[PDB]
């Protein structure tokens, strides 16, 4: 395939630049396909606000907390089944594909040829893609040591906190290897594998698993009211070039995710080429809708689940005497998204509408959890005060009305009040129905508790 086809991520051409003095006068980031793929496609930085991510001058790093998703991965078992099916449905067309689907004629292989890769991080070992998730995680580890490394005492073991999802675990490991470089060994790094079982309660990197009363589908109804007409138009366009083509809107909907994962896996996907920006945007909003209403503030149970890690993170912030200053936590998009429902920095004031497409989406799921998502809390001293701020996918995201400190940070005293108010009236044990652990302890007790859950293939 020509290097002129699918050789980048931008759904815009050179036309963007045609009347500019400088290419820097152009706004082309908006057209990045990843932003429309619901967090399934490769890592992308948050749009951000222009705030420098450097620690401000005259401030000194006190502590950092990373909450990271796994890196890019193969489809899940469930999705893989869907994509393999739609591939088989497509391939069983009797006819030669024309138009956007013409690539389907060209000895087009299914991008997951071995199902053992389903659920796995893409890596140099199983993928030819530059967007390999383990690569993402290693490069992140490196970058992260570069920036926050002065907080690391090399006489200390680096603790790593990870759920037992194999891909989350492998992320944590590639991250730690990036961070530690040629000092990485079984002795300089201790990984605490925190089980996803419901019996971990709030003592978890996936506290939703112990929250029995949380129904992620509490709002599927409202989400289903959002138009799917773009799926029909697209299906109809495919049929116009391919008469008799037997696929549905359901098949078409699956092809956005198919695009995202083939991109992850192969580094380029012809499946990405079949949709217009406008279809991408509507697909994207249907994902924001789904995630907002399942995983964020649209679901009235995410505050309480999200607060477990908000609390623990705040405890870490408040304890300045801990020898360890670097908190490395790895988990899933959903956990990070629910954590964000409690953080409250990327959460809209009102529930998302379904009767129109809002611009922008008041809730951007990919701005919070792309593949390789990173939610970082920086703590630093400036004079006689400590300040806290969030760096979400490499953008500083100021806490609303707590952004007066250097780098639009929140005085730790004010951050205390902010968190208090976010978590007011939450009670995990009681709202969730789970009498296991009521709070996170694993950041503190991992030396005396063995977090060695075995890895699951999810």
């Amino acid at each position: 395939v020509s290097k002129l086809i699918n050789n980048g991520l931008l759904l815009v051409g050179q036309g963007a630049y045609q009347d500019l003095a400088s290419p820097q006068q152009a706004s082309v980031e908006q057209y990045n396909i990843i932003r429309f793929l619901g967090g399934a496609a490769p890592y992308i930085q948050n749009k951000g606000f222009g705030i420098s991510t450097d620690i401000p001058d005259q401030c000194t790093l006190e502590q950092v907390q990373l909450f990271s998703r796994h890196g890019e991965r193969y489809p899940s078992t469930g999705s893989g089944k869907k994509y393999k099916a739609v591939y088989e449905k497509l391939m069983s067309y009797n006819g030669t594909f024309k138009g956007e689907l013409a690539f389907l004629n060209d000895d087009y292989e299914y991008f997951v040829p071995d199902s053992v890769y389903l659920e796995k991080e893409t890596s140099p070992k199983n993928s030819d893609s530059i967007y390999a998730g383990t690569t993402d995680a290693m490069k992140h580890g490196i970058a992260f040591r570069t920036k926050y490394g002065e907080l690391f005492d090399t006489n200390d073991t680096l603790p790593v906190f990870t759920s037992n999802s194999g891909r989350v675990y492998q992320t944590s490991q590639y991250f730690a290897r990036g961070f530690m470089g040629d000092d990485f060994s079984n002795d300089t790094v201790k990984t605490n594998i925190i089980s996803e079982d419901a019996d971990m309660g709030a003592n978890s990197l996936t506290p939703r698993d112990g929250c029995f009363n949380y129904n992620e589908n509490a709002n599927t109804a409202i989400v289903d009211e959002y138009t799917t007409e773009y799926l029909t138009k697209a299906l109809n366009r495919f049929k116009a070039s391919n008469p008799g083509l037997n696929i549905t809107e359901d098949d078409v909907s699956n092809l956005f995710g198919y695009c995202a994962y083939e991109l992850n896996v192969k580094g380029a996907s012809p499946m990405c080429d079949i949709f217009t920006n406008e279809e991408f945007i509507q697909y994207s909003y249907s994902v924001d809708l789904d995630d907002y209403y399942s995983n964020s503030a649209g679901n009235n149970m995410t505050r309480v689940i999200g607060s477990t890690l908000l609390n623990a993170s705040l405890e870490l912030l408040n304890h300045d005497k801990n020898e360890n200053k670097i908190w490395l936590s790895f988990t899933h998009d959903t956990d990070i998204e629910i954590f964000h429902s409690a953080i409250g920095i990327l959460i809209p004031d009102e529930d998302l509408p379904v009767d129109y497409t809002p611009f922008p989406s008041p809730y951007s799921h990919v701005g919070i959890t792309p593949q390789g998502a990173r939610t970082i809390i920086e703590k630093y001293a400036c004079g006689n005060e400590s300040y806290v701020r969030y760096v979400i996918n490499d953008a500083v995201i100021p806490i609303k009305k707590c952004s007066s400190g250097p780098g639009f940070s929140c005085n730790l005293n004010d951050y205390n009040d902010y968190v208090a108010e976010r978590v007011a009236g939450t009670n995990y044990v009681e709202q969730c129905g789970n009498n296991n652990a009521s709070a996170v302890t694993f950041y503190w007790d991992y030396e005396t508790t063995n977090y060695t859950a075995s890895l699951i293939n999810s």
Copy 2:
């Protein structure tokens, strides 16, 4: 001066890319200096939403309206003279400048050589800047012809509507020249210069001029509540390196515009180097506040004023049969802002806060009126329906709840209801206290009325 210094517009270096597979995974556009300079600095495209600006497939162009600001300019008289005063205060420091202000020692000339350039477009003739306002307008005209020229009948004169401001008028001419290329002549283009005189009432590209009850400064005390502490900190930093340096917070505040203008004029400004991102962002928000409360929905009078052009534009869209399909109007940022107060697509639901810095700014002045600002309405037919949409600084901005047409456009029928809602209860004559023209007629009566005001230097 090293080509490594001020060789671009981005307030970020290469660290943005350091853990990515592709540079397209980076979000660096948030860091563009222009976005913090309040519309004073060169043109920049609206961040946008990824909507293809192309006319959608199966859609046929019917009409386009352009509402354009003048291009990049030299400082106005007031600002220029304020910049000259600050320059002179700096030059009379006795001492060698150190730190960020050191460039002041280096035969640093004031950037406006001749005060005759105040108020004027920068151009190849008066400026060595690639960011020249006339270049921007000319390239825009070319691009605009390339996009919309199928709508132009070459047997017909191109009408141009411009206010009689020199810079605005010159913009219109460079644009028309870009548009018409080697067909440009006093025969193929007829420019209607619409006076900024208050006696023009609503029949004006600057209807605020005839609005007597409009007080742009009505909300200054609110606006002035916003923090100036960053100015003090910046000043103290300058003083720390330059003991006894005698300038004010007011001076420092003017150095932002000085930066924006020296950038326009010279193509680079050492003065841009003296601020942190955090200062630019607060500066930027002070401008958003001032313009929101003066020129937008913060001021109760702007909806009535803005509605004059909104109505006129709607009359144009409603009228199928006009031989002329390309509307080209040139005016100031203020008029376009007030216009947008009535358009209502880039207007926040609520008044801007003053007691903290919101992220993002709920009202982005530079998203609407950068130098060389362009507000475009495209009208196109898809099937048996006509659709309208806005392209503001090269980004489609869908109308809230009127964006289900192709390319997120509004059915002209629905667009009628939207406009009616926007202009409801407005009355120029009565609200403004002006009994001259009550409505725009210049788009229709310009062949019988001689619109030929003499140019003013403002």
Copy 3:
């Protein structure tokens, strides 16, 4: 068509960046398709040597000479015929195209639907392409006034020198309009249209036309020895996906130019997608070969033709008292290429080989004459000396062993000796067999001689 397809010019993907800290560590320019299209595709800057194109500090601009090709154009009459034929040959395939050629099924229109555009500059009026040649020329004019404008006395008419090729003429005009801005009129610009008739002799912007003894095909034999096997491999690949496909290597060869012009005309060409880099590179070298041996030092008659303009240019350089300091000449690639055979700055020491592909090509035709090619001679004073240097497609190209002056320039005294040696033993009248004008005079006599040749459609 997806904005992920053909949305740039680079025959490389994101893979180039995958192991870098900064995207600026990547070399991706080498992959620009334009460089392989033999000067037929849009303008591209010369690779260059990193030499700043600014006039050095402490130097002051004395004089500038532009020798410019026309901008991007539609195919010629001859080429158009070839491309239309290959399109018709392709379209008459009975079968559905598969593979690279699949786009041929998709209601693929021939990109020159009206033959009146053959030979013409692409423009906003006849083309949707951002690469419109008139746009290129206008933007150049603007840029050129920005840089060299201090040499322009606005009390003077700008003289423009152009051959009577309609597209060259139109280039000169769009250039002059860019340069003059809103001061462009019949009075501020005087265009001297220099006939391409053989009877102009050396008094010509196309002195090859008066050189009867010049045989551009003196070396076709050696050029034909260069491998064409890549054409077979490509043809075979097309046939493998399309059994029965009746096209030849001749057809395939025509498709590189078809790619180049559809790119010019439409801004993107699916025809560009059918070749590998390796085919592009070999096509490209066959063009370098052809042009080197026809138009440059491989042909023993180009020195003498090239010296006519080298001499005239040098005369202009030596006459510091001329009121006019800006020499604007427009002509064809071949004339500029032959001029370069005499200039000697981009000419290899040995003739090009044909029995292998050399890397790099010792003679890069597209580095000298892309569409919109610009060969500029800058003259500037530094202290008590004047210096001369070449800026070829926006890159400074130092004269070998005359690059000691500021900006790697040649002292005008040394430049005199350099030109003397380049033109030693040339005699246009005698070597060419033409007893018309023996030397260029039109730079000096255009006020008293009327250069108003009528425009030809070539």
Copy 4:
């Protein structure tokens, strides 16, 4: 310090784009500062020729050899101490620095905090630079696995060959770690540390060490003929702004390396801002000259020395049946340069001139050995033939007259003839005067010879 200053590597601003339709029409890579810093500054990819670095379609990887320099490093002892001496001369200026040297006033620290870092790779651990040498090596390993890993059998140990230089050795380990990812261990990788001791003779990654008749300084008097006038001019400029500043031309010459090293160490260097492009280019050529005459074909001894690795590499390509297909060798720039003296693909036909500055430099040292230099031989099968080609710093560099295979590769049969031609009449023992090992055996006998030299700080 402003993010507008030193925020990139390019010695050009936005003016490069000002008359283009697409920024991809610009040639800005010529302006990269790295290309003028003589291999001292961060990694940069070879400018290259547009050849796709992908394995050609229908070709199957058979073998790869990597010859890698150490990554970016701190200054060597000598250079570091020279930089410290210049820093101290500058700091003892009594006076406030003005002009380009003003940053010297701003609590400007010397960039090597601890002399223990001299000779060492920059890494996340000792450096906050994105350009860290270890990061570069690690990312390279990842990329290399992604490209070549189909050739790796995971049942087999990965052998690594490195010299015992600390920085080289560390490079090899970061690379291997990138390559092996979470499979890296002392079991999956076996590193063979090949001593730099002269007693190693030709069985060495640094065979120049055992070559007694090799005088790297044989040609210093030739090299010293090249102009130093630019140093005087630079110095006089520094003096003009700083009266009585007491530094030499020698000092100024060292400030180029200081720039390169501070860039490596800090990620930005104010010292890079003190030179013009024209000075960097002359500096750059002084380094090309020195290295051409010391480490390449300018020195009569390098072909014999280089031929040791050329022969060994050829023995590897000739031997189909080795279970190991991935050769990873790590050594210094000097060894790779001398290697290239025998490879002969980036070697000029003639000795470099000294009496002027050629464009381009006929021998580009940084094109061969930037920090993190990579010379790769790929061997792949196309049909019943095997092909060999070179990828130097991410660019395919075809062998002259052996580039007609797919991807401009050389049939291994032809490659044998090429190598034989290159090594003809060479004899290490006799030409070098060293009777220790006469040939490389370490690639074959490393499982029976213990290659385990102790690390040196050089």
